[PDB]
Design a protein around this ligand. Sequence first.
Ligand code: MET
Ligand code: SF4
Ligand code: SF4
Lengths: 230, 231
Amino acid sequence: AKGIPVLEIFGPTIQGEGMVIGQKTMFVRTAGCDYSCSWCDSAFTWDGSAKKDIRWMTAEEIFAELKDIGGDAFSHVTISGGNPALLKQLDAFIELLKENNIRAALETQGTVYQDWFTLIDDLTISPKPPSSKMVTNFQKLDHILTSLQENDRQHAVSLKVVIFNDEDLEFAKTVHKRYPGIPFYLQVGNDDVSLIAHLLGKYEALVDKVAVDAELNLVRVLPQLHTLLW
Amino acid sequence: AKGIPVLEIFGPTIQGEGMVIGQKTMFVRTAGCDYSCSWCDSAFTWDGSAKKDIRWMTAEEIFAELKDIGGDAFSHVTISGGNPALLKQLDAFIELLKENNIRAALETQGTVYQDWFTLIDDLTISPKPPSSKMVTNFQKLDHILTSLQENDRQHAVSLKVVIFNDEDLEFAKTVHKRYPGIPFYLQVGNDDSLIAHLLGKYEALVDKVAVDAELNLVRVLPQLHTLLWGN
Ligand code: MET
Ligand code: SF4
Ligand code: SF4
């Protein structure tokens, strides 16, 4: 259990949200989360239901399976969870992706810092809104973004906040106004219920609210391309 | 100086494609295109259908109307056409946007180069595929990207090639392999329900790139503005 807890490896596919939306990438979803958000779409990563399905793999084993699935049709890998920032062992895998000249992306809610953050080309910090029933530690969020700006990583970091209600939108203003020099992405909240027409109505409704708000000018409102496709 | 040929000024809205998709911005559409692409969705910018509807405004007049439409709910302006690169007069309007601390974006096919290219925060070079029946001058395209990489503007330039068939996809490989360092974008072409048809075209384009080894550092995106409001 000294390796990397891997849950699923699939691709190539398109990143459907965030800073690198549309990027063709391979996904390596790891296990473990320090959050228990109310609308966690990947609860199996932390509730223990997929504990038996965990495959503790080394860095070279993950890369070998990435080549058996993606072949040579990928140059970008996305690590997700869960909260992959909880795993310090990922440093060996992120370093392995760099040796093979492969760009790496990762999303974390911003509760724990790792030294290998400086190696991520597309680092997404995603603070969770109050609708998740999670308390946001802005002190730890400050330390992470400050450490990234000191290590000359501003070009690789973005902020993404999912919006389910008007209270989440006010939370996004607090995060955006606190870190003005960081690209800010607003994502539409998904409520599992022709859901494609229901989602474009939710996306357009969020765009209309941001269009009239003067405090959310340097933001990017995006939907989830994956849920619209599949 | 000289007035800027403006066709329409609206916003705030979101950018629906490419380098800064989803970015809230104000659109300032200029007139004049040195191309005549067969599927030009903005034919009125160059065919001469709306010569009377052109307002030759100065840099201060355009910025004044931007504040009347969007007020303080915008910090990003996108210049579209047409081919705004044919207008040297835009240097005054872009400098005015930088003075007011406003980011600027522009998309051009990449024929003519201007000095104010170094002032664009989100510059998109969009070479046209063979389906446009246009001839791509790669010798003239190399000059633009070389000038940007010399003026330390590689962090603000991207390539975007719209795809309608398999022949356009092979043209995107030639452009992507010719400029590896520049971020590359693939966009779905619209035949012009429309929404359910474009998703099938976007899904089909994703499946083709998913098994392609030459188009790896590529972002495949549709037209978001068409999926919400259509034509
Ligand atoms: C759909 S990928 C993201 C899943 C989950 N919201 C996370 O933070 O990892
Ligand atoms: S951070 Fe993501 S994976 Fe973790 S509980 Fe929240 S939604 Fe689920
Ligand atoms: S370059 Fe763009 S605006 Fe100009 S003719 Fe071609 S499609 Fe139309």
